[PDB]
Amino acid sequence: ETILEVNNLKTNETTPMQRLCFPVSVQSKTGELCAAFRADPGRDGPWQSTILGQLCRYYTQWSGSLEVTFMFAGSFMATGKMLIAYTPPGGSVPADRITAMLGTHVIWDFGLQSSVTLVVPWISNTHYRAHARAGYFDYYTTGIITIWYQTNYVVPIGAPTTAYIVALAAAQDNFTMKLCKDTEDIEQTANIQ
Amino acid sequence: ENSNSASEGSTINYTTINYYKDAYAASAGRQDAQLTIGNSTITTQEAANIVIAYGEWPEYCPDTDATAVDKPTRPDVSVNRFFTLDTKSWAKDSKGWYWKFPDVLTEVGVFGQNAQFHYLYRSGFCVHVQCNASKFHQGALLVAVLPEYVLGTIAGGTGNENSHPPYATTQPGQVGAVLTHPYVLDAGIPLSQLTVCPHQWINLRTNNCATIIVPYMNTVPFDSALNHCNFGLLVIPVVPLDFNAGATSEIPITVTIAPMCAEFAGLRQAVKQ
Amino acid sequence: ENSNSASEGSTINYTTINYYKDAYAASAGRQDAQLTIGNSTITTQEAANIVIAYGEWPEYCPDTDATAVDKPTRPDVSVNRFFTLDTKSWAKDSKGWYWKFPDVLTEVGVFGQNAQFHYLYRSGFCVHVQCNASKFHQGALLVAVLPEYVLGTIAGGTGNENSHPPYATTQPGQVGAVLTHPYVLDAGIPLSQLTVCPHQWINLRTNNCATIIVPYMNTVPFDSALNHCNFGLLVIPVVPLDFNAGATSEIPITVTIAPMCAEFAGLRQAVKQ
């Protein structure tokens, strides 16, 4: 289980440590979207920081059920529940929460459990799956993982009004790979002296 | 003597005198774990014992009670799952909220499109009320289930005018509606006795969640989903939430319900209302 | 030696020499009633023997061939029934008509709304072609089923221009479309050899109906209903209808199709196209 980077921005490149956590704060409106990212591990994005992502670059086709674990680093007096959903391919990011309930979602509470394990099921029109990218190969798109405020993030007097959640990702027992391949990440432009 | 009386269906026998051929003309007579998952859904609601309404789990229709000749449809996975409705916000001036079932789910999901294509309807429901507050807050909610909840009006306040509730009041939808007179429940019936119906108290110093398993309660095996609303859901705070300044002022309430064992019959063209 | 070759799934064994550890590097080797009712529907189509395509009845997906972890939905009654599409009209200048499946049923009925809510798709189909004429008429039709029927263009007629068929041509809907070059089937393939695929002749002096039971034919157990069209339906008159003046000039053609053993998976939000 290695740290998945959900927060990756163009303003975080100067301070790379801000990239491992995404904030959670009290909201004025209920049902606001917090984080959304694609579930394809071998694709440019959040999944490149995962040891699974770097080992899925050496292999083209991959099939199996993944898992994405979240961890709440906030205080002990912080209470709230957030919806964590997975949308099968063919849609965009769900506009509101009423469209994100129709997928496979889990309800997870801060004040009770400090960690949640979301199991992304294997839904595919093929036994295996190649690495999806822009243009013509996007037909392998895995889905979209979203995180929604369900109730709110409630804080008492004296505790901080902000909180940070760390994302963690791994693979299940049935995850397999094949068709070994060169990797895109490493680049040698000059002789090593 | 064949029994044409009205008690024939019961398993209890009485001693009753009859001077005629019809048994209904006789006298009265002397008497002798877990991780709840609908299909793909999960909630956190804890723990252990939850309220089964009237001690019966939602089940299918027995072959003895069903007069419909056609074979009903049972979309197990696509129908029965947790549906999260719109969130509310608790305020110090708040009164209550009431939802009608199965009004809220007619516009949502596959369950909504099958209720439109099909004439009859049968299902059980699972109600989950969701509220979160810190250990410095305080308050109490009452979550009740009232079979056949009528909405009465104020008769203009003089009592001499005949007024009926509009369609928007009796068919709220997934957005619910607010009660203007919680004490009489806008039915003319007291709130103090509301706990006779299945209920759970949400007390902010004990439990943050409530769960009520509601079976299918009707005089007929199958019913129409669009016309007839079975039971209401009342969330009425008995004790107002009170918090000192500086804490979180917005305390939301979320209602996540799921159908259980839904049977549909009488396929036809799409009918909205 | 574990078999990594491409023939491992077959039940036929060959004698093949291999000098390496991988079996795919080996040599080629030497070789060794009725009254059809879907749920509630009836047709009249007669009689006795009808064409089963490739000698296989539509069935569910075996547990060995299904990689989907989720449990599929099987709305037996609401999905599988006869659906009557729009009627055509035969004319002496007519050429042909082609329908794409399951394009026609995506907008119709419960089957259409489930294909929108669900990602994957599997079903078998039952095609019924309907044509009526008196004993004084004459003519012949050819009803064929072509798995993976591509639509080629004329390349502008010079052949040097690259042109692709529009979305309205490749996704006709329940209204079908007409062929501008029946001889090449607009695929570049002859009409004379069209009977290699499952076919039935409708001859006005013999039979007024045609029925083709089509199984699910794809390289994958489940497929997407919106993107991928499985097979086409071609009704091309080989012999033009000819009738003397005074008879009925309008001879309609009706296509009534039904799905068989439809499984849906991957529930999601509504997606039109």
Per DSSP, the residues of B160-179 read -S-----HHHH---TT-EE-
How far is it, in rounded angstroms, from Cα C8 to Cα A129?
21
Closest-CA residue of chain B to C70: B40
Element (H, E) at A55: helix A51-55
How far is it, in rounded angstroms, from Cα C79 to Cα C261?
9
- DSSP string spanning C173-232? -TT-EE-S-TTTTTTT--STTGGGSSEEEEETTT-SEEEEEE----SSSSEETTT---EE
**Nearest CB to B135; choose among A104, A153, A156:** A156
Torsions phi, psi for C232 (to 5 deg): -100, 165
The answer to whether B179 touches B19, Cβ cutoff 8 Å, is no
How far is it, in rounded angstroms, from Cα B143 to Cα B96?
10
Between the CA of residue B268 and those of A26, B115, C110, what are the distances in Å?
Answer: 47, 10, 10
β-pairing, C209-214 with C51-52?
parallel
How far is it, in rounded angstroms, from Cα B250 to Cα A153?
9
The answer to whether C70 touches C265, Cβ cutoff 8 Å, is yes
- Contacting chains of A (3 CB pairs or more, <8 Å) are B, C
**Share of chain B residues as helix, strand and coil, in percent rounded to the nearest 5:** 10, 30, 60
Among A123, A145, A178, the strongest candidate for a mutation testing the C interface, having the largest count of C CBs within 10 A, is: A123
The answer to whether A155 touches B248, Cβ cutoff 8 Å, is yes
Please state, as a whole number, how many other Cβ atoms lie within 10 Å of the Cβ of residue A120. Answer: 20
- The structural domains of chain B, ordered by start, are 23-267 (2.60.120.20)
Closest-CA residue of chain A to B89: A30
**Nearest CB to B73; choose among C70, C75, C113:** C75
Half-sphere exposure of A145 (CA within 13 A, CB side): 24
How far is it, in rounded angstroms, from Cα C169 to Cα C179?
10
Q: Do C113 and B113 touch (CB under 8 A)?
A: yes
The two tokens of residue B218 are 């009707």
Q: Does A109 touch chain B (CB under 8 A)?
A: yes
How far is it, in rounded angstroms, from Cα A149 to Cα B124?
28
Question: Distance (Å) from the C-alpha of residue A156 to the closest C-alpha of chain B?
Answer: 5
The two tokens of residue A152 are 């709110």
Task: Quote the longest CA-to-CA distance of chain C.
Answer: 79
Which chain C residues are within 8 Å of A119, Cβ to Cβ? none
Q: Do C120 and A126 touch (CB under 8 A)?
A: no
In the block, which residue shows the tokens 């009265």?
A: B28
The answer to whether C196 touches C116, Cβ cutoff 8 Å, is no
Half-sphere exposure of B42 (CA within 13 A, CB side): 19
Q: Is C69 exposed, middle or buried (0-12, 13-18, 19+ CB in 10 A)?
A: middle
Q: Does A150 touch chain B (CB under 8 A)?
A: yes
The answer to whether B87 touches A31, Cβ cutoff 8 Å, is yes
Which chain A residues are within 8 Å of B208, Cβ to Cβ? 79, 109, 111
Ranges of beta strands (E only) in chain A are 2-4, 21-25, 33-38, 59-63, 66-72, 79-87, 104-109, 115-120, 144-154, 162-171, 176-180
- DSSP string spanning A139-159? GG---EEEEEEEEEEE--TTS
Give C108's DSSP letter: S
Nearest-5° Cα angle at C68, C64 to C72 = 100
Closest-CA residue of chain A to B109: A102
Residue type, A34: C
Resolution (A): 3.3
How remote is the C-alpha of B171 from its chain's centroid?
14
Rg (CA), chain B: 22
Q: Which of B252, B250, B237, B262 is nearest to B101 (CA)?
A: B262
Q: Do A91 and C269 touch (CB under 8 A)?
A: yes
Half-sphere exposure of A88 (CA within 13 A, CB side): 25
Residue B116 backbone zone (phi > 0: left; psi -120 to 50: alpha; other: beta): alpha
Q: The domain containing residue A114 runs over which residues? A: 1-193
**Nearest CB to B87; choose among A30, A109, A121:** A30
Which chain B residues are within 8 Å of C118, Cβ to Cβ? 78
**Nearest CB to A79; choose among B40, B83, B133:** B133
How far is it, in rounded angstroms, from Cα B138 to Cα B202?
11
Q: Is A154 exposed, middle or buried (0-12, 13-18, 19+ CB in 10 A)?
A: buried
The answer to whether C186 touches C151, Cβ cutoff 8 Å, is yes
Please name every residue paired with B69 in a beta bridge, in sequence order, or none if there are none: none
User: Could you tell me how many CB contacts below 8 A there are between chain A and chain B?
Assistant: 98
Domains identified in chain A, total number: 1
Residues 6+ apart with CB under 8 A from B109: A102, B78, B83, C117
**Nearest CB to A112; choose among B46, B130, B252:** B46
Buried b (16+ CB within 10 A) or exposed e, B89-98: ebeeebebbb
How far is it, in rounded angstroms, from Cα C180 to Cα C236?
11
Rounded to the nearest 10°, the torsion over CA A102, A105, A111, A113 is: 160
Q: Do B87 and A106 touch (CB under 8 A)?
A: no
Q: What technique was this entry resolved by?
A: cryo-EM
Q: Which of B103, B74, B58 is nearest to B218 (CA)?
A: B58
Closest-CA residue of chain A to C118: A88
